[PDB]
Amino acid sequence: NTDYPFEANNPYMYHENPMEEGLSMLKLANLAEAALAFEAVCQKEPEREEAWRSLGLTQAENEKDGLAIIALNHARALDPADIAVHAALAVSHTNEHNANAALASLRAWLLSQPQYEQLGSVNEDFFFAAPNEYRECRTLLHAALEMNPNDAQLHASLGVLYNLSNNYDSAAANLRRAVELRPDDAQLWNKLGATLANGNRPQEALDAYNRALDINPGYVRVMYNMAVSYSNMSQYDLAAKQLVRAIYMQVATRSMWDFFRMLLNVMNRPDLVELTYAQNVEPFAKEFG
């Protein structure tokens, strides 16, 4: 449960400083690669935190929350004040439906900021099961919000919290406030996309996701998230096209194949479903390049 399942035959076990190789693969809009690189820095230098953080932060973007949490926990193990790790933790547990671990992470994100640590003096009606923890850091983030009316990362955090309680009404208001401020943050355009999609407006969502891919043309979550909206609107041709681009860009892959298996299913292609068990995205022709 503790350590990372490192991928064997890592070509960066042979490269002198691979941190820099990866950091610019992330610059080259190529997550699958940049994850391998950082996987080496973590194996070569266990004690270096910006390696575990870049690793986690990247795996989350590469649609693998599993490995992302394992990685961020080691980055946190090394520096428990690291607001970017905690920000990311909250997002990942929210996605993974681990509520208590999410609230804890948001709270920790806030209280680690020196400009808010003044708030550590703390003390039926509104939603959540896991209730004291949620009433707390909802208060805490509003107090933070009436200190600094236009902190984008404060809205984005409220957005995260309101997704956990299934209030995509308020989540979308805040995450809309958060982009606008920072209209070129891909992380933030996706968050809007997902909030909207979860709150049953996939139409709008698809807009929000396109702005994200305009900024980071190789962001694998999002490609996946676009499949999820197209699937929810029962436009399965489109979902299918989008998932393939997402599977391709992911590199083996995941339960990503399980999702593709149920599309081809409802689509009435017993063939194709039969040959998903080969690694190969190769045969699946509607896109080329």
Binding site: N95, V160, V228
Partner: peptide, 7 residues
């Protein structure tokens, strides 16, 4: 329509 989107 019932699948979950990711933040």
């Amino acid at each position: 329509s019932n699948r979950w989107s990711k933040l």
